[PDB]
Amino acid sequence: PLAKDLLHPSPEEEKRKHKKKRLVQSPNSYFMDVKCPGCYKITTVFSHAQTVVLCVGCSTVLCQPTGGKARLTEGCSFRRKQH
Amino acid sequence: VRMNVLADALKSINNAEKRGKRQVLIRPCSKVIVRFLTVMMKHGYIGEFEIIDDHRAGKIVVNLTGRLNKCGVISPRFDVQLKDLEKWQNNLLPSRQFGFIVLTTSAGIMDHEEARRKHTGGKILGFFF
Amino acid sequence: MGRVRTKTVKKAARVIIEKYYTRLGNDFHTNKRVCEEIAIIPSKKLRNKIAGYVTHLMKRIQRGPVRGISIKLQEEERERRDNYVPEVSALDQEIIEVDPDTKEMLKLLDFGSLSNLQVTQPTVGMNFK
Amino acid sequence: SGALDVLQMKEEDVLKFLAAGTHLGGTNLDFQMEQYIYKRKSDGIYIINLKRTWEKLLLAARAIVAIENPADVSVISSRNTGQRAVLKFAAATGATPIAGRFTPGTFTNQIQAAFREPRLLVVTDPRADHQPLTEASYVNLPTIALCNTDSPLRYVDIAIPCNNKGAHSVGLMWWMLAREVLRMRGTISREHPWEVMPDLYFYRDPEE
Amino acid sequence: EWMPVTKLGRLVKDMKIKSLEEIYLFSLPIKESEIIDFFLGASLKDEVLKIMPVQKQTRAGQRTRFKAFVAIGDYNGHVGLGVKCSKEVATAIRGAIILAKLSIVPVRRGYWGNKIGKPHTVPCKVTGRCGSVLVRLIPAPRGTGIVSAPVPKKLLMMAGIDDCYTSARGCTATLGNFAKATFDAISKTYSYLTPDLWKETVFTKSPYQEFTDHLVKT
Amino acid sequence: MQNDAGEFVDLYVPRKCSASNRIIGAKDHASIQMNVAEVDKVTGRFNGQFKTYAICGAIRRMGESDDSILRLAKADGIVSKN
Amino acid sequence: RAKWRKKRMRRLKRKRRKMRQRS
Amino acid sequence: TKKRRNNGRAKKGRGHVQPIRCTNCARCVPKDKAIKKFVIRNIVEAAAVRDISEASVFDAYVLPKLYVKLHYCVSCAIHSKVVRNRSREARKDRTPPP
Amino acid sequence: GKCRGLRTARKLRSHRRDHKWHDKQYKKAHLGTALKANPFGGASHAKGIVLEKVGVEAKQPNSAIRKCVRV
RNA sequence: GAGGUUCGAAGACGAUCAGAUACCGUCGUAGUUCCGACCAUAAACGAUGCCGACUGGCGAUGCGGCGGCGUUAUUCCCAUGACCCGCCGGGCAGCUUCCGGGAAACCAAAGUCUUUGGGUUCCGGGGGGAGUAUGGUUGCAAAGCUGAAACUUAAAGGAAUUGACG
Ligand SMILES: [Mg+2]
Ligand SMILES: [Mg+2]
Ligand SMILES: [Mg+2]
Ligand SMILES: [Mg+2]
Ligand SMILES: [Mg+2]
Ligand SMILES: [Mg+2]
Ligand SMILES: [Mg+2]
Ligand SMILES: [Mg+2]
């Protein structure tokens, strides 16, 4: 109301805004660099997966896909932090 | 759909200044927008606007002031032949004492006064006053 | 049925009492001819009819004080009640029942004060649609 | 008001605000009041920022003080919790009180016993005593209010964000206003506290 | 003789406020017709517009009661419109003048185009509209006089507009809101926000505030 | 409003809301003009002068006024950095 | 009613078809 | 002159919606329209409760209830005083107040 | 709404054309009928022979006999 | 063409009524039921064209997503799932207000309109005559679609007001 400094919007109130509605359009998605228990190999899985992500090794299956984010299998880690 | 990107924008910067809104952003952006807003900047009709560069189209964010009663847009850009320029600025502006028909001639985008100093006609865009 | 009172009576009655609470009592025939003194009531019916509420308002007063009424003792009584006060109304000894978030408000203030903060239970919310 | 140095928030003051619960708002939130809040807890009770709560409090002070003749400040309460309060700042400042019914156009009418062309309102709840605010549209009446989180801000110069619900809290505000308005100019040191307690300011239920 | 009950009233009769421009400035409600009678003694000539008989219906015949409109102005800046309904014609008129008197406003007048001499017309093309009907007031080069229907001419001639072409429509017959639409036309001259204004206001005290000493009277 | 001879015509220059720059009516009775005092700088005490400060009707009936009081007040150094 | 005159004419015209078609 | 914004009807977001014939006039009405009482009347009523609770072979005994979904066309709803006919301001106030 | 475009000079002309066979005052003037129907063949006055004198009875609210001529 | 549960134009009687070829009764044909062709209209109604922009609140809910603080359960957790508390998109809706509209009733939109034009589709120009005549066309036909005039006519109408009678 009568004074919203649109150009310098505080970090919180872009994350409560639909991706394209923001001041600059950025995504709300991410890749995660995933461990899994058997192999030490790290796959570069994208959160919003669509497909089933299989291990570079073989046997294990990492990510069942669902509506939004991917369902990691049972006991496996991930790493956002980048860019 | 988005046919005319002025009408789009100018509605939303008339239509804030009624509510007394301090500043507004305009979603699509354009060259023509910038070039016609910078005209409004000179006669005072707005303050400094700061264009965001979303990689695609552009957004702008217009500092408003109280001063703009209305800005509108003549949607088809009729071709104004300099003899008509009067007959327009009669029936499209509140007085002969202020009010600015922004149009677009041979020598750039500008108000009607500046097309008259250079003695050119061209295509009407809109008007603020 | 026959007799509910008229506003010449209800108003005059209430206004005698406002002005002669001390003079009147809870009898009829006494305050009956008090009214002959302190007023110029022309008709005997009315003269007499007025000492109507003059009694019906004393029978009320002893039992209770009217929510809206004219009185001297009550106004005097009210002043006395107002003066009485605790030495500190809001001191609340030592230790206020404070939420952790409330503690957070103090931190932004940067003030430091004594207080244990407890947060407990599920976030039930309020009401049952 | 923004007390850059001297007329700062202090500590003895803050404990009052906490004790009475003047920061504990209502469950709900009229957006005009999202400037004056920091969190809601669980349950769903909003928390007013005692810093802003005060700045504003002085802001009303500056404005009442501004009034050259102190007896042309109307001070209203219709809800009872202010009834006592308003009389008591009114007596402290020498301002003019209206407790109970905001009576028919005391602002309009050159015939009713009460008119008054006062130059500032003060009100307990905009929500409740909501005539005088509206009559304050027909005269050029600024208007201080003792808003909650749940309170519309049609016609208020300035909103003091508080509880205005538990009598206990109300009084405090009618104090602090009274206090500041006499500290500013009047007849208090700044350094020393009052003769006057709060206890005087926040009503009594039928008790004795 | 007065008995000014309103403070704004008191200040007027003791040569305290100099010109009503000092009232309008602060947007204060005039509420005593005699005020405007101080402050525009003589001048202020008062023309009735219409005496239209309304009438409401009841178990026995029809209550008939008259509605007078009156226009007021000083051929120099200030004009007003008063509409009073009463049981009798002379009461209506007399007591409509009392309202018109109250509800007078100043009209800002401007200039054709060449910026010379004294102000003969309206600054902008203002419009004003009352329930359907609407009246537009177009600026006007000197000599043209007023170019309208009778009724807006009789309000504009009063305002001290010398020249204006108008454009009106709706149900222009319904005189009341022929005249009330072209009340709000000439009110909204001074609401027109032009470059000519556009300078931040210096600001000044107030009558209540300067003279607050004399109101608590001595 | 000058003319040829710099001649200030127009019987008054209206006030003008502080919050919208929008010109405040002749008969806009929901106008305000809030006078707000300053202090000595050290002790307290309104002594000196005055932050005058106007607002139209429309902004009041919108609900703002106090949003638009603060923002001005804290520009004018009365309020500060909450 | 409306419905019962639209139904009048849609009976009456049908008599002019019949009357006409004879000749 | 739209009387009820809603139309006394409670449709919105649809088209032809199940019709139901009334429990009095036998008159056809929509489901969203139509007044819908649902009576939980005791079988025995107020009087006989204690005749029957004496004569009962069993001890105590709760007694059953009829669960009828009454279901009136508006005609019979008004004629037989289920609803009434309110003021312009009142028409709106949709709460159900005992 | 209206068509508003810039190479729409016809859709407009041809719009404002036909939406005159819904005017009443032109469908007298431009159709045919009028010239065909009015005994006065588009002509201001006309001459004719008086074949008898006939009184006409005026329309209810005003009773009287009007005194006309069959021509 | 199949079938005949009820209801039920038409149709038969009983009453009611001055009469009732009506209502209220008792029968019951076409049809309502199915499968196959046509017909192409509703008060087919939100009496609101479709796309597109902008302008306030506040509650609710359907779906999806996202986040969190809960716990019932459910298991050692889990996964869940079921409740709670948030946010986000787009859905059906509600209230509230001197945005602003709006003849008015009213309308987050019927707002942005003498401060007149974002794109475009349709379509009305006093009432009847008349949705008639005639012409054309589709249809097996009811009818559908297209669709005049002479003549007459001063209001017909809409929104709200008091009345006054139900
Ligand atoms: Mg034959
Ligand atoms: Mg349907
Ligand atoms: Mg068959
Ligand atoms: Mg039957
Ligand atoms: Mg159709
Ligand atoms: Mg429309
Ligand atoms: Mg248009
Ligand atoms: Mg016609």
Author numbering:
A (entry chain Sb): 2 to 84
B (entry chain SW): 2 to 130
C (entry chain SR): 1 to 129
D (entry chain SA): 2 to 209
E (entry chain SC): 59 to 276
F (entry chain SV): 1 to 82
G (entry chain n): 2 to 24
H (entry chain Sa): 2 to 99
Copy text from the publication.
The majority of these proteins are recognized co-translationally at the ribosome by the signal recognition particle (SRP) and targeted via the SRP receptor to the Sec61 translocon for insertion. The S domain is involved in recognizing the targeting signal and interacting with the SRP receptor. Its functionally essential SRP54 subunit contains three modules: an N domain that interacts with the ribosome near its exit tunnel, an M domain responsible for signal recognition, and a G domain that (together with the N domain) coordinates receptor targeting. SRP is anchored on the ribosome primarily by its SRP54 subunit near the exit tunnel and the Alu domain at the ribosomal GTPase center.
Here we demonstrate that endogenous SRP is efficiently recruited to mammalian ribosomes containing a transmembrane domain (TMD) inside the ribosomal exit tunnel. The cryo-EM reconstruction of this native complex provided the first structure of SRP bound to the ribosome in a ‘scanning’ mode. The SRP density in the matched scanning mode structure was found to be remarkably similar in overall conformation, position, and relative occupancy of all domains. Similarly, the entire S domain is grossly indistinguishable, indicating that the TMD-interacting M domain of SRP54 is positioned at the exit tunnel even prior to engagement. Relative to the engaged state, the scanning structure showed markedly underrepresented density in the region of αC2, but clear helical density within the SRP hydrophobic groove (compare top and bottom panels). This suggests that in the absence of a TMD substrate, αC2 shifts to occupy the hydrophobic groove. The structures show how the hydrophobic cavity of the SRP M domain is occluded by an amphipathic C-terminal ‘placeholder’ helix until its displacement by a bona fide TMD. Hbs1-DN binding, observed in both cases, reduced SRP recovery by up to ∼70% with the scanning RNCs, but had no effect on engaged SRP-RNC complexes.
